[PDB]
């Protein structure tokens, strides 16, 4: 768990509620979503201008949820060996 | 182009009827021929042909002889060899 | 923006000469030749057509 | 037409169009001239690269603007024609407008003033031509030699050269020639001009053109036979001294 | 002579069956250690005799015996790269006082780099965050690299200078490994300094259209930005970005949070160029009674690289002009030589503002 | 830019044609003799074999 | 077009030469000399001003310098009695130092066909004409006569 929480920023609550309905609610409420017959969201794309939110809000998602976190970097997926990038 | 690198520039003129006459007999000297042909008449029908085209006529001269199953090359093969090479130069 | 597509046909090179003028002189060597001679009783002109 | 400004200030404060235009003169023929007491002389060279040039039908390197004043250009022989034609029209215009013959000071300010327009006018390029205006004002025997730079700055000079090998001739005019004591005869002014051209023309005859300007509307251009007479006397006093 | 003393131990440190160790890396730890060899072979072993259970860490090179595999001694990780071993220099010749002038651009670099290293408890009272990165670009020829070697002298620690063409390697994807090579030593060697030279050939934002191959360069920055500012905010030392082309840089790279102090070199004024000739007056030969304020005044605004060429050429006139020491007359000739004579190309002097 | 020229050659092989015209140039050359000099220059300086 | 750098290899290769002449620590021992036909097309930042304090310009020699250059190539050459060095220099017009050696080499080849010990004057006359015509192609460039 990291040391960052949701209380270290402000004015981003509009975009925070989007992450609550993505990777947060399907964890506990998965039994509720099966009754409505809807599939849980598989992810969301967050871009914005560089230097706003992004990796900071991801730390709050890996903290308050208190779950496992596995980081996978995109530029680390390019290797000189054929097939190593897909492996 | 300036001096100090290439001290001699030789311009190669294109082959002619009199030029290809002596070239045709050299490449055909390594194969079977017939004294009933003409050296300057075969090269007269060809115009603007390079050195590889002259060897192509000599190379294809024995190809038509294999169809008739004969050990000699008469004027019939040279007339068919020139017509095949001239079509390759005019194509593409 | 009209500054990018403009190649600046007339400008001074760092050597102090013009670009397009030097390139226009090369077109004369790739074109038909023209020769003339001023004689005592007249002037003889000559040229040759290309291609 | 074309409204885009070619002249742009460099971050150092200079101008690319003005600075690079100065090298058109340094690559051109050497134009040197001197002034005496009652006389003034303007010399110029010719390119020896090409031969078979008819002298009579060839335009002179020193163009005549008026009877009492002339102009000697250098550098590019192309853009020099635009400055000469517009200066001759102003010569008749100033004579018509103010009913006065043009002077050397006014003609220099006009030629330099035209060059200052193209630098300040969007869509045109400055002249790469440096002109030397010399002559005698009406009812004045004092020669006025004014230099016109491609940048638009004009100045007066007793002995000044422009074109290739300028630094070699300028050092020659600052030693053997004195501004405070110029020669009082015409023959000494011609011999000094020939010596200044020996460090550039490098042993040539038909490539040397010298124009002598005299007051009272008198312009005499030295022929090929008259220039060689001064060359013979100088070469005998050069190697032997 | 020294080999004879080491031959006594040859009956032990050589003939022993321990020393022939096979180096490998432990992939999985179960507290049974899964260890992958260099031959593409794996095995599972336990601890050794002197091996401590807390010494073995996940993803660390661990040597084992060649015959019967057993853990013997741990080894530092990242043994493959040989390139970054030569990037660390020692004792640069340029000192802190070699930069000419009293200009305040010197005071800004020492407070963001030298101050937290020498006095880490000064900013701890206010509870602030010292700037992680800096910015030095300027026009070419102002002595920017002199300030980079001046800080390394006062630092008295590890200094790393990275070439802009060194990061991009001969394979696709190896440049991403080159970035992790630099930041791995930051945790190994604490309180060091990393420096990037000519980051323009590195920095991204080259877009796409028409080249088709520009995506290989931008992937280096995407690894560089990730290793700098990642998910886990991992950082310790200071990062220096230096290039002569600020225009072609990634506009995201210039955004703060990876860089705080921004210092761009300018052209020294009459008072700025005065100290340039004063620091050079202690060298060479200077005639007594010569005022250098008149020499710098006749010279217009130009880069600092052309200012030191004046004093270098000034001493070269005495050879041809037959002089004992450099006088004021030879100084005026350098103005028309170093400056006015060289005005044809071979110079910047505010030539490239952007590209 | 323009000046006067007694014998000038502008076109392909500029320096090649002006060399033959300068050596054979004469001040007393008439019109009939000038045609032969200009005709023989085009024959040697062309890219063809014969001259039609 | 057989070597493709994608315009990205342009900077990485050129800036490597710049970082070795600036960022590389040296006491002044390494001497790097660069010369070509035109250096103006190159990036002036790559020239690294202030490290190179010598800018040398070369032009075409005059009639006085060509007399000394011609005597150098003809020093080891056997010349006839009628061949004069000052005669060939006068004929030379707008020629560089490489054009002078070209005539001395071509004149040796003309006499090589006839196999003469001393090269006569008729060989130099035919050699100087072929160099400035077929061998050397003189363009107009900046001219304006």
Swiss-Prot record, chain A:
Residue spans crossing the bilayer: none
Subcellular location: Cytoplasm; Nucleus
Origin: domain of life: Eukaryota
Phosphotyrosine modification, residue list: 6
Residues bound to ATP: 48-55
Post-translational modification: N-acetylated by NAT1.
Function: The 26S proteasome is involved in the ATP-dependent degradation of ubiquitinated proteins. The regulatory (or ATPase) complex confers ATP dependency and substrate specificity to the 26S complex.
Entry similarity comment: Belongs to the AAA ATPase family.
Protein name: 26S proteasome regulatory subunit 6A
Originating species: Saccharomyces cerevisiae (strain ATCC 204508 / S288c) (Baker's yeast)
Taxonomic placement: Eukaryota, Fungi, Dikarya, Ascomycota, Saccharomycotina
Gene: RPT5
Covered range of the whole protein: 175 to 261 of 434
From Swiss-Prot, chain B:
Description of post-translational modifications: N-acetylated by NAT1.
Places the protein is found: Cytoplasm; Nucleus
Source superkingdom: Eukaryota
Function per UniProt: The 26S proteasome is involved in the ATP-dependent degradation of ubiquitinated proteins. The regulatory (or ATPase) complex confers ATP dependency and substrate specificity to the 26S complex.
Note: Present with 4700 molecules/cell in log phase SD medium.
Family per similarity comment: Belongs to the AAA ATPase family.
Oligomeric form and interacting partners: May form a homodimer or a heterodimer with a related family member. Interacts with OLA1, TMA17, and UBR1.
Record-given protein name: 26S proteasome regulatory subunit 8 homolog
Range of the intact protein held here: 305 to 396 of 405
UniProtKB/Swiss-Prot annotation, chain E:
GO BP annotations listed: positive regulation of protein catabolic process; positive regulation of RNA polymerase II transcription preinitiation complex assembly; proteasome regulatory particle assembly; proteasome-mediated ubiquitin-dependent protein catabolic process; ubiquitin-dependent protein catabolic process
Gene Ontology MF, one: ATP binding
Alphabetical keyword list: ATP-binding, Cytoplasm, Nucleotide-binding, Nucleus, Phosphoprotein, Proteasome
Any one of the GO CC terms: proteasome regulatory particle, base subcomplex
Modified residues (Phosphoserine): 52, 119
Function: The 26S proteasome is involved in the ATP-dependent degradation of ubiquitinated proteins. The regulatory (or ATPase) complex confers ATP dependency and substrate specificity to the 26S complex.
Name the UniProt record assigns to this protein: 26S proteasome regulatory subunit 7 homolog
Native source organism of the sequence: Saccharomyces cerevisiae (strain ATCC 204508 / S288c) (Baker's yeast)
Gene: RPT1
Part of the intact protein present: 77 to 467 of 467
UniProtKB/Swiss-Prot annotation, chain F:
Origin superkingdom: Eukaryota
Compartments where located: Cytoplasm; Nucleus
Per UniProt, location of the Glycyl lysine isopeptide (Lys-Gly) (interchain with G-Cter in ubiquitin) cross-link in this chain: 44
Other facts: Present with 17100 molecules/cell in log phase SD medium.
UniProt record similarity statement: Belongs to the peptidase T1A family.
Assembly and interaction partners: The 26S proteasome consists of a 20S proteasome core and two 19S regulatory subunits. The 20S proteasome core is composed of 28 subunits that are arranged in four stacked rings, resulting in a barrel-shaped structure. The two end rings are each formed by seven alpha subunits, and the two central rings are each formed by seven beta subunits. The catalytic chamber with the active sites is on the inside of the barrel.
Function: The proteasome degrades poly-ubiquitinated proteins in the cytoplasm and in the nucleus. It is essential for the regulated turnover of proteins and for the removal of misfolded proteins. The proteasome is a multicatalytic proteinase complex that is characterized by its ability to cleave peptides with Arg, Phe, Tyr, Leu, and Glu adjacent to the leaving group at neutral or slightly basic pH. It has an ATP-dependent proteolytic activity.
Protein name per UniProt: Proteasome subunit alpha type-3
Organism name: Saccharomyces cerevisiae (strain ATCC 204508 / S288c) (Baker's yeast)
């Amino acid at each position: 768990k990291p040391t960052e929480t949701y209380s270290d920023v402000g004015g981003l609550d509009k975009q925070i509620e989007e992450l609550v309905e993505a990777i947060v609610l399907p964890m506990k409420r998965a039994d509720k979503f099966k009754d409505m017959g809807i599939r849980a969201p598989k992810g969301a794309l967050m871009y914005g201008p560089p230097g706003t939110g992004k990796t900071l809000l991801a730390r709050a998602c890996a903290a308050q949820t208190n779950a496992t976190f596995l980081k996978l970097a995109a530029p680390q997926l390019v290797q000189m060996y054929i097939g190593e990038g897909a492996k | 182009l300036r001096p100090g690198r290439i001290d001699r520039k030789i311009e190669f003129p294109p082959p002619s009827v009199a030029a290809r006459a002596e070239i045709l007999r050299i490449h055909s000297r390594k194969m079977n021929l017939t004294r009933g042909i003409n050296l300057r008449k075969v090269a007269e029908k060809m115009n603007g042909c390079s050195g590889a085209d002259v060897k192509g006529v000599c190379t294809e001269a024995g190809m038509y002889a294999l169809r008739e199953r004969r050990i000699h090359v008469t004027q019939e093969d040279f007339e068919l060899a020139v017509g095949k090479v001239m079509n390759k130069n005019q194509e593409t | 923006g009209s500054r990018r597509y403009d190649s600046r046909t007339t400008i001074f090179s760092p050597e102090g000469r013009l670009y397009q003028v030097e390139y226009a002189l090369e077109s004369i060597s790739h074109a038909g030749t023209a020769i003339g001679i001023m004689a005592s009783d007249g002037i003889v002109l000559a040229a040759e057509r290309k291609v | 037409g074309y409204d885009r400004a070619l002249s742009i200030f460099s971050p150092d404060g200079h101008i690319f169009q003005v600075e690079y235009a100065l090298e058109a003169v340094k690559r051109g023929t050497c134009a040197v001239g001197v002034k005496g007491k009652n006389c003034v002389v303007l010399g110029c060279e010719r390119r020896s690269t090409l031969k078979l040039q008819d002298t009579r039908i060839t335009p002179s390197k020193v163009s005549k603007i008026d009877s009492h004043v002339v102009l000697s250009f250098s550098g590019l022989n192309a853009d020099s024609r635009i400055l000469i034609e517009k200066a001759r029209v102003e010569a008749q215009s100033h004579r018509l407008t103010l009913e006065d013959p043009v002077t050397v000071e006014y003609l220099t300010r006009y030629v330099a003033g035209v060059q200052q327009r193209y630098t300040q006018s969007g869509g045109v390029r400055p002249f790469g031509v440096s002109t030397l205006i010399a002559g005698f004002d009406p009812r004045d025997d004092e020669p006025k030699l004014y230099q016109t730079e491609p940048s638009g700055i004009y100045s007066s000079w007793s002995a000044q050269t422009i074109g290739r090998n300028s630094k070699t001739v300028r050092e020659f005019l600052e030693k053997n020639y004195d501004r405070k004591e110029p020669p009082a005869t015409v023959e000494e002014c011609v011999k000094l001009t020939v010596r200044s051209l020996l460090e550039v023309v490098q042993t040539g005859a038909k490539n040397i053109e010298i124009t002598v300007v005299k007051p009272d509307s008198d312009i005499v251009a030295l022929s090929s036979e008259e220039i060689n007479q001064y060359v013979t006397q100088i070469e005998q006093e050069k190697q032997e001294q | 002579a020294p080999s004879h003393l080491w031959d006594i131990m040859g009956d032990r440190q050589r003939l022993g069956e321990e020393h022939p160790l096979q180096v490998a890396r432990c992939t999985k730890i179960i507290k049974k250690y899964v260890i992958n060899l260099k031959q593409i072979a794996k095995f599972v072993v336990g601890l050794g005799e002197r091996v401590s259970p807390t010494d073995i860490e996940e993803g660390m090179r661990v040597g084992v015996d060649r015959s019967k595999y057993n853990i013997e001694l741990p080894l530092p990780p990242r043994i493959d790269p040989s390139v970054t071993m030569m990037t660390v220099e020692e004792k640069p010749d340029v000192t802190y006082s070699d930069v000419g002038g009293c200009k305040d651009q010197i005071e800004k670099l020492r407070e963001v780099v030298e101050l937290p290293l020498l006095s880490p408890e000064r900013f701890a009272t206010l509870g602030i965050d010292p700037p992680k990165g800096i910015l030095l670009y300027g026009p070419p020829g102002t002595g920017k690299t002199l300030c980079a070697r001046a800080v390394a002298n006062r630092t008295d620690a590890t200094f790393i200078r990275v070439i802009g063409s060194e990061l991009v390697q001969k394979y696709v994807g190896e440049g991403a490994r080159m970035v992790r090579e630099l930041f791995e030593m930051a945790r190994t060697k604490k309180a060091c300094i990393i420096f990037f030279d000519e980051i323009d050939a590195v920095g991204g934002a080259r877009f796409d259209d028409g080249a088709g191959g520009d995506n290989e360069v931008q992937r280096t920055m995407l690894e560089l930005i990730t290793q700098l500012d990642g998910f886990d905010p991992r950082g310790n030392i200071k990062v220096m970005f230096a290039t002569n082309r600020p225009n072609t840089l990634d506009p995201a790279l210039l955004r703060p949070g990876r860089i705080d102090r921004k210092v761009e070199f300018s052209l020294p004024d009459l008072e700025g160029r005065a100290n340039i000739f004063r620091i050079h007056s202690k060298s060479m030969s200077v005639e007594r009674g010569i005022r250098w304020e008149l020499i710098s005044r006749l010279c217009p605004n130009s880069t600092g690289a052309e200012l030191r060429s004046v004093c270098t050429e000034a001493g070269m006139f005495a050879i041809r002009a037959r002089r004992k020491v450099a006088t004021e007359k030879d100084f005026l000739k350098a103005v028309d030589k170093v400056i006015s004579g060289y005005k044809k190309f071979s110079s910047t002097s505010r030539y490239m503002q952007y590209n | 830019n323009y000046t006067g020229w007694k014998a000038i050659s502008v076109g392909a092989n500029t320096s090649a044609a002006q060399t033959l015209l300068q050596m054979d140039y004469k001040d007393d050359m008439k019109v009939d003799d000038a045609i032969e000099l200009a005709l023989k220059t085009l024959s040697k300086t062309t890219d063809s074999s014969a001259l039609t | 077009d057989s070597n493709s750098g994608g315009e990205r290899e342009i900077q990485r290769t050129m800036l490597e030469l710049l970082n070795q002449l600036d960022g590389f620590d040296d006491r002044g021992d390494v001497k790097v000399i660069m010369a070509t036909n035109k250096i103006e097309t190159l990036d002036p930042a790559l020239i690294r001003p202030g490290r190179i304090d010598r800018k040398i310009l070369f032009e075409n020699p005059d009639l006085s310098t060509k007399k000394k250059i011609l005597g150098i190539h003809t020093s080891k050459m056997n010349l006839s009695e009628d061949v004069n060095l000052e005669t060939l220099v006068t004929t030379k017009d707008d020629l560089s130092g490489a054009d002078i050696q070209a005539m001395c080499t071509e004149a040796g080849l003309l006499a090589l066909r006839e196999r003469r010990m001393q090269v006569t004057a008729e060989d130099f006359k035919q050699a100087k004409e072929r160099v400035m015509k077929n061998k050397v192609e003189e363009n107009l460039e900046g001219l304006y006569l």
